[PDB]
Amino acid sequence: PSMKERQVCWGARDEYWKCLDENLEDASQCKKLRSSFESSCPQQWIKYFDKRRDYLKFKEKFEAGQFEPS
Amino acid sequence: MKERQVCWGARDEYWKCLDENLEDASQCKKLRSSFESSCPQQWIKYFDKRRDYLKFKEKF
């Protein structure tokens, strides 16, 4: 994709993630920004970003559990 | 701390099984059982998501 298209893809991924972060992962609340993300990014990049998101979220859950024993 | 070393070792042995069998997890079911038995559930989910990510990142 062009430099512009890459920036629009990365910004649409940032807005979608920012949606999921702020709204405590309710993803049926970010269907508009998910559409924008899917329309803006190469299919391979959407797959890469979704897998990276899952990794980072579960890593955060893992490190949280270690820092705050109950 | 022992339990923690055991879980990391189990995750290493399972992952090395996946590497040697080109990611056919069905070839590594006994090591998968050992991994699940040695690690907290929260950790297994983290490691599984790391593995899914790193294997996909390899195509690039």
Curated annotation (Swiss-Prot), chain B:
A motif (Cx9C motif) lies at residues 7-17. A motif (Cx10C motif) lies at residues 28-39. Disulfide bonds join 7-39, 17-28. Residues 4-47 form the CHCH domain. It is found in: Mitochondrion intermembrane space. It comes from the Eukaryota. Belongs to the cytochrome c oxidase subunit 6B family. It is linked to Mitochondrial complex IV deficiency, nuclear type 13: An autosomal recessive, infantile disorder with a fatal course in the first weeks of life, characterized by hypertrophic cardiomyopathy, left ventricular non-compaction, lactic acidosis, metabolic hypotonia, and mitochondrial complex IV deficiency. Interacts with COA1. Found in a complex with TMEM177, COX20, MT-CO2/COX2, COX18, SCO1 and SCO2. Interacts with MT-CO2/COX2 and SCO2. Interacts with SCO1. Interacts with COX20 in a MT-CO2/COX2- and COX18-dependent manner. Interacts with COX16. Involved in the maturation of the mitochondrial respiratory chain complex IV subunit MT-CO2/COX2. Thereby, may regulate early steps of complex IV assembly. Mitochondrial respiratory chain complex IV or cytochrome c oxidase is the component of the respiratory chain that catalyzes the transfer of electrons from intermembrane space cytochrome c to molecular oxygen in the matrix and as a consequence contributes to the proton gradient involved in mitochondrial ATP synthesis. May also be required for efficient formation of respiratory supercomplexes comprised of complexes III and IV. This is Cytochrome c oxidase assembly factor 6 homolog. It comes from Homo sapiens. The lineage of its organism: Eukaryota, Metazoa, Chordata, Craniata, Vertebrata. The gene is COA6. The chain holds residues 52 to 111 of 125 of the full protein.
